[PDB]
Design a protein around this ligand. Structure first.
Ligand SMILES: Nc1nc2c(ncn2[C@@H]2O[C@H](COP(=O)(O)OP(=O)(O)OP(=O)(O)O)[C@@H](O)[C@H]2O)c(=O)[nH]1
Ligand SMILES: *[C@H]1C(=O)c2c(O)cccc2C(=O)[C@@H]1C
Ligand SMILES: *[C@H]1C(=O)c2c(O)cccc2C(=O)[C@@H]1C
Ligand SMILES: [Cl-]
Ligand SMILES: [Cl-]
Ligand SMILES: [Mg+2]
Ligand code: NA
Lengths: 130, 1017, 208
């Protein structure tokens, strides 16, 4: 008896770290932070290159608000307002198309999360050197 | 290149206009933005209207012609009466001529529906200005032209539709009362001719586009035409049969039949009743034969969303509910109408299964209307048993999440904490419970059996799912109050027993979290049961304690909220000793309070102590209550005592950010207990009061030191936000206590002086960014409860906060938003309760008081604006109460006309429409002051006006001058007639308001009729 | 595949805020009145490919209205916006709707009550019935909390594509540049990074 007849680009990556976060970019002209998105921050290790990137998608729209290599060169810095955020300059984020530079800030739900993120961020940097 | 069209010195290049229009509508990026600005300037140029004839003749771009009509529409509505007679006739001619020409070319009539519907609106604007006083034969000649061409016949149905809309549906806001009445009367006079033309097309008309347009015109006529046009012709039969069979006329007919199901109709005449029954019989017949049978799955139809099915099912829902709400009694007595009554209701049952929140609410409104009537109306409910029984299943199976349930399923399928309140869902849940409560009374055996048997199919796992245990539990909870103590006893026992079995069986944190949230919703909803059954209540409370030790934040949070909820209703059963118990349950809870709350986050621990507060306030013996209180506060008082011995041994231990957190949590714990115990909190407050005010002082210095060392950016640091939180929570604790206190002596003699000494100077002498708005809030509660007992204390509050807070908020409407709000709340209560304080201001500062009030008017922030107008009203009454004494006479000379003109400015500027009612009431009170000769001295200065002439006469002369200069396009007579009417109406608010709305219409145009202000007289 | 969307409603209702949240992710707190119209491309990714809305964000203030109903010509869908904290903005929903359907007969339209995040709500859910007879979809939304912020676009996409099962899906994610400039060798680093550290992040009292 005949039967009744019937790509994210993350399938080749492994999830090392996941944390809920809000991401901002600094607008140098206006001198204010502007939100770029709220959602899951993921550290994704490519199984073929062992390269680790940040990838972060906005809740509901699933649109990319961060896509960049966790570069050895980058440095996490505190922000005067917050014991649960980091600030750093990224020179190649492709979330909104062509490679652009940004000063990001990323805030978490608790200092614990921010301290874990920093620990994981530096682990991924070691992975990217080798 | 494109900027050429703005240069009016040269002839308008029409090819260029058309490119600029194309670039805007069809282009993109900078080119489109460039074109947008050029077109907006072209259109606003006040001589652009002189070019419209040129553009309508020569343009090859419909959108250019659309914009020419926009330009004309702005001239017709606002400056028409200044045009000389030749220009009005000419413009009339080429609009009428353009319309006819466009209709007589079939290709234009087909493709350019936008441009024609805009021309038709523009013509209706000319009718609002000219008809019928300078165009008496418009309607007859429109009827005439209709038979020349099917296109012109149809287009003329659109013109009359627009005319009906502008005169009956949208007149209230856009014309004076007099002019709306004139145009209403004018259409009413000529409707007989209009209806006969409309009726001929419905009987005889071939063209589907012409029929549709005719019926669209009739939808509008049904808002206002007398019933005799609907009931004494054949139109009901036509709509309810012929126009329902064709799908291209079905939507608009069904909307016409909905409006008919509301027409104004006599309820004492058997033949009008038969006709109302008939069109309904006819419509339900056409639906059952031509669209779908009663048994059809409307849910699936709606989900598939083919063509206009969603629209049609929406309009059907609206038709059935409108008609049945008004007329179901007509089908309820006659046995020949029973099948039709129940089939109509069956259509609504099928519609109520559709997955679409807003439709579901539309039907649920109807179900409420029905089950409410069946609850009260004798001999009716038996008719609807089978409908009511089906409705029970629909609602139990589509219950949405109550406010109380804090666990919810996310879009990766995890059971998580609820991110935010869904006001939409919460209201829907309440609407569902009102219906389901009613249905339960109508048949309590049916409701129990449905719920009991659904529970049995969760037990044995056959229909088990998170959706299915959730809807059942929410429904089971929603019906508390509907049963007897006895069936409730067994019902609830069975539900609790069986739900506890689901929790004990089911594995994984997701399953346990769901079942636990359901157990908690249910037991929370049945206080009556819990009161009577100590062992159950005790075990539910002991189970809430077990959930407070779960890893899932949602389960924990809800356990605390359920605890509060149970305790608000069962507090008595914890305060006394039950039989078979060692001690009152309160005392057992207070012992283990450290163990039972160990895994709770702080704001949940605080909720827990608030609950203990509620229990403790059930004990009325003063001895026991002060003790229980002292026993509860052991942990935080023990932390407080050790934190105050360290903190005063050196001001530097507070730097420890951990100690700032511990401290704020101890004050938050006190805030929580005070919230629920109110006036019974006094002993515990006093155990910390003087030491707590010293911490306020200590913390305040560190804040000021940090700002000076690090700059303003210090206010943003974790350290300083932590310190400011200690200050806010202390203010909140005192605010909370004083709001509820009964012993007001102790408040004035023990609490007030140290509080004012601790907070006022520190507020006045800190930089704007370091000032806590909570100080103003605290002070509002102090003035409200004890102001009358502390006149000099109120003076002291004003001096400390008035000028410095005003200086923060008087540069713009945005900065220091909390300050702005709390500020105007403080000045309202002071002006209400302690007005002497304003008498004791130096004249310069009283002048800033008046400037601050008027500044509040001009806010679009509602919290400020409403307080602004209330202060102004209360001030005017305070002043009036003083009578004929120098300060009141000086007040009126200095400030009367400033209040009048500042009230007029916000009335007439079109940016404060939210405050219209209160503005009008203030302006009325001010004008009426002068009439009732309550102002005891001349408002005018010495050599301005004849000696002896009254404040009344001068009020009108000042106001005529003020409006003449503020609105120079008005005539002297418009201003004279407006004021004459406005003044006579200073006791009748509704009429006065009407005269103001009339003025607001006339100031947006030229040549308003002065006699319009006689509408009331 | 692109559709003209007009966004209309009273001044201060949150139209430009709503659009900016969708374009960039940002929450604009200031009220800068739109002058006539601003057009913004907005793309969403769906299980039926990309859908693009040309969003014609219009002025609500009379004195800044510009071309007014002139903006509605050839619109394929629309959003009417009012403010649940401001009764006058709901009382004006019928006037915006009138002006719109006289130009755009038979297009899909969403009614949006914005600012439901605000505690003291003036236009209660039970008041909001205007959409029923006019066949508008209604949503409670908040551009601030993002409550239901995606729904207007998801519903409209469903009606314009004629597929009621259409979902937003995870937009593809290309491997990002692995060779990058050390930002610490670019001179303005010290000036850019100090300014960013010493400007406080907004809303430090939010949950994120
Ligand atoms: N609390 C809250 N405020 C909001 C929300 N959306 C917008 N606002 C604020 O309300 C104001 C309205 O901003 P706009 O978006 O410019 O208003 P608009 O409707 O575009 O006004 P016009 O351009 O004049 O028609 C801003 O200060 C916003 O930050 C919301 O969801 N919640
Ligand atoms: C206009 C009209 O066009 C018409 C058609 O098309 C058919 C039958 C009757 C009429 C009229 O009398 C209407 C004037
Ligand atoms: C009240 C009123 O205010 C008034 C003024 O001020 C001038 C002239 C006539 C009147 C009235 O008749 C009103 C009763
Ligand atoms: Cl004018
Ligand atoms: Cl609500
Ligand atoms: Mg805007
Ligand atoms: Na009727």
């Amino acid at each position: 008896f005949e039967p009744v007849v019937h790509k994210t680009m993350e399938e080749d990556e492994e999830v090392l770290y996941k944390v809920r976060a809000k991401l901002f970019r600094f607008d140098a002209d206006a001198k204010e932070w502007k939100e770029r998105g709220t959602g899951d921050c993921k550290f994704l290790k490519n199984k073929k290159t062992n390269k680790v990137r940040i990838l972060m998608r906005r809740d509901k729209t699933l649109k990319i608000c961060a896509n960049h290599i966790i570069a050895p060169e980058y440095t996490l810095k505190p922000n005067v307002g917050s014991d649960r955020s980091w600030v750093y300059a990224c020179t190649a984020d492709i979330a909104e198309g062509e490679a652009e530079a940004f000063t990001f800030a990323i805030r978490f739900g608790s200092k614990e999360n921010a301290d874990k993120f920093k620990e994981e961020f530096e682990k991924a940097q070691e992975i990217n050197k080798k | 290149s494109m900027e050429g069209i703005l240069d009016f010195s040269n002839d308008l290049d029409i090819a260029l206009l058309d490119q600029v229009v194309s670039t805007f509508y069809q282009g993109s990026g900078v080119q489109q933005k460039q074109a947008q600005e050029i077109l907006t300037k072209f259109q606003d140029n006040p001589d652009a209207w002189q070019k419209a004839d040129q553009i309508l003749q020569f343009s090859t771009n419909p959108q250019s012609k659309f914009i020419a009509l926009s330009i004309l529409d702005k001239l017709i509505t606002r400056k028409w009466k200044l045009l000389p007679n030749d220009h009005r006739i000419g413009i009339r001619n080429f609009v009428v001529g353009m319309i006819i020409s466009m209709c007589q070319d079939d290709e234009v009539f087909k493709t350019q529906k936008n441009l024609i519907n805009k021309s038709d609106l523009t013509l209706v604007q000319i009718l609002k200005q000219e008809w019928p006083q300078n165009w008496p034969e418009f309607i007859p000649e429109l009827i005439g032209s209709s038979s020349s061409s099917v296109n012109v016949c149809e287009n003329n149905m659109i013109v009359l539709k627009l005319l009906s809309e502008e005169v009956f549906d949208f007149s209230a806001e856009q014309m004076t009362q007099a002019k709306a009445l004139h145009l209403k009367n004018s259409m009413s006079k000529e409707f007989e001719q209009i209806f006969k033309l409309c009726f001929q097309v419905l009987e005889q008309g071939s063209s589907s586009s012409l029929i549709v347009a005719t019926l669209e015109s009739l939808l509008r006529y049904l808002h206002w035409i007398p019933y005799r046009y609907i009931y004494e012709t054949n139109i009901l039969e036509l709509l309810s049969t012929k126009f329902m069979t064709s799908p291209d006329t079905r939507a608009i007919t069904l909307k016409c039949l909905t409006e008919v199901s509301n027409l104004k109709i006599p309820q004492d005449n058997d033949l009008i009743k038969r006709q109302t029954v008939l069109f309904f019989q006819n419509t339900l017949q056409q639906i059952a034969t031509s669209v779908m049978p009663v048994t059809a799955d409307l849910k699936a139809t709606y989900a598939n969303a083919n063509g206009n099915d969603q629209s049609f099912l929406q309009d059907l829902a609206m038709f059935l509910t409108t008609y049945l709400a008004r007329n179901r009694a007509l089908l309820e007595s006659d046995e020949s109408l029973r099948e039709l009554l129940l089939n109509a209701h069956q259509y609504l049952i099928q519609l109520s299964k559709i997955e679409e929140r807003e439709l579901f609410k539309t039907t649920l409104d109807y179900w409420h209307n029905l089950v409410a009537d069946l609850f009260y109306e004798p001999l009716k409910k038996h008719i609807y048993e089978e409908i009511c029984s089906q409705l029970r299943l629909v609602i139990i199976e589509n219950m949405v999440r109550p406010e109380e349930v804090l666990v919810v399923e996310n879009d990766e399928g995890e059971i998580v904490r609820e991110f935010v309140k869904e006001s939409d869902t919460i209201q829907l849940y309440k609407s569902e419970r009102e219906v389901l409560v009613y249905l339960t009374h109508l048949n309590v055996i049916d409701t129990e059996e449905i719920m009991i048997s659904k529970l049995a199919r969760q037990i044995d796992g056959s229909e088990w799912s998170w959706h299915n245990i959730n809807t059942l539990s929410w429904a089971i909870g929603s019906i508390s109050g509907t049963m007897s103590e006895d069936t409730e006893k067994r019902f609830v026992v069975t539900v609790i027993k069986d739900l506890l079995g689901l929790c004990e069986q089911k594995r994984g944190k997701d399953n346990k979290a769901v079942v636990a949230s359901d157990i908690m919703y249910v037991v929370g909803q049945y206080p009556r049961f819990l009161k009577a059954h100590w062992n159950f209540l005790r075990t539910v409370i002991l189970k809430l304690f077990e959930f407070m030790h779960e890893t899932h934040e949602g389960v924990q949070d809800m356990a605390c909220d359920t605890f509060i909820k149970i305790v608000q209703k069962c507090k008595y059963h914890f305060v006394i000793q039950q039989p078979r118990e060692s001690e009152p349950f309160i005392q057992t809870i207070i012992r283990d309070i450290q163990k039972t709350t160990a895994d709770l986050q702080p704001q949940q621990v605080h909720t827990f102590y608030k609950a203990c507060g509620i229990i403790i306030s059930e004990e009325r013996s003063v001895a026991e209550r002060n003790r229980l209180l002292s026993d509860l506060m052991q942990l935080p008082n023990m932390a407080w005592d050790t934190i105050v011995e360290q903190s005063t041994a050196n001001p530097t231990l507070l730097l420890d950010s951990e100690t700032v957190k511990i401290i704020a949590n101890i004050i938050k714990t006190n805030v929580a207990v005070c919230t629920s115990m109110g006036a019974d909190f006094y002993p515990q407050l006093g155990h910390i009061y003087y030491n707590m005010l010293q911490l306020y002082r200590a913390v305040s210095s560190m804040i000021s030191a940090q700002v000076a060392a690090e700059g303003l950016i210090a206010t943003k640091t974790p350290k300083v936000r932590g310190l400011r939180t200690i200050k806010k929570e202390i203010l909140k604790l005192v605010e909370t206590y004083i709001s509820k206190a009964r012993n007001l002596d102790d408040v004035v003699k023990v609490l007030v002086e140290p509080l004012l000494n601790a907070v006022l100077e520190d507020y006045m002498n800190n930089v704007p960014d370091a000032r806590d708005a909570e100080v103003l809030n605290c002070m509002t509660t102090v003035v409200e409860k004890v102001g009358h007992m502390i006149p000099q204390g109120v003076i002291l509050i004003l001096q400390s906060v008035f000028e410095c807070t005003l200086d923060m908020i008087n540069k713009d409407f945005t900065e220091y938003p909390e300050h702005r709000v709390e500020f105007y709340k403080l000045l309202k209560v002071i002006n209400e309760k302690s007005f002497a304080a304003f008498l004791e201001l130096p004249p310069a500062a009283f002048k800033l008081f008046v400037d601050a009030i008027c500044w509040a008017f001009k806010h679009n922030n509602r919290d400020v604006e409403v307080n602004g107008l209330q202060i102004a009203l209360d001030l005017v009454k305070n002043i009036e109460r003083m009578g004929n004494v120098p300060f009141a006479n000086e007040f009126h000379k200095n400030y009367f006309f400033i209040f009048v003109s500042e009230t007029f400015f916000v009335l007439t500027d079109s940016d404060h429409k939210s405050g219209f009612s209160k503005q009008a009431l203030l302006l009325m009170k001010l004008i009426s002051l002068v009439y009732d000769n309550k102002i005891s001295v001349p408002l005018y200065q010495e050599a301005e006006v004849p000696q002896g002439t009254s404040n009344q006469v001068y009020l009108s002369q000042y106001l005529a001058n003020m409006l003449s200069n503020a609105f120079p396009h008005l005539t002297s007579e418009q201003i004279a007639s407006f004021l004459s009417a406005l003044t006579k109406q200073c006791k009748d608010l509704v009429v006065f308001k009407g005269t103001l709305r009339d003025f607001l219409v006339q100031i947006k145009e030229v040549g308003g009729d002065p006699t319009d202000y006689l509408f009331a007289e | 595949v692109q559709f003209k969307l007009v966004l209309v409603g009273d001044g201060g209702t949150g139209k430009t805020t709503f659009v900016k949240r969708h374009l960039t992710g940002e929450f604009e707190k200031k009220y800068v009145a739109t002058l006539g119209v601003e057009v913004h491309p907005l793309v969403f990714h769906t299980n039926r490919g990309p859908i693009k809305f040309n969003v014609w964000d219009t002025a609500g203030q009379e004195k800044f209205g510009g071309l007014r109903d002139g903006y509605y010509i050839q619109a394929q869908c629309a959003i009417i916006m009012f403010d649940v904290t401001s009764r006058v903005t709901y009382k004006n929903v019928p006037n915006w709707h009138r002006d719109l359907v006289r130009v755009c007969e038979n297009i899909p339209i969403v009614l949006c009550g914005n600012k439901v995040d605000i505690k003291d709500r003036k236009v209660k859910a039970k008041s909001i019935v205007f959409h029923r007879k006019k066949n508008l979809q209604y949503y409670d939304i908040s551009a601030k909390s993002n409550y239901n912020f995606e729904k207007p676009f998801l519903w409209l996409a469903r009606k314009l594509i004629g597929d009621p099962n259409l979902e937003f899906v995870a937009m593809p994610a290309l491997a990002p540049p692995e060779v990058v400039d050390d930002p610490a060798l670019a001179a303005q680093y010290e000036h850019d990074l100090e300014v960013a550290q010493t400007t406080a992040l907004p809303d430090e009292d939010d949950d994120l």
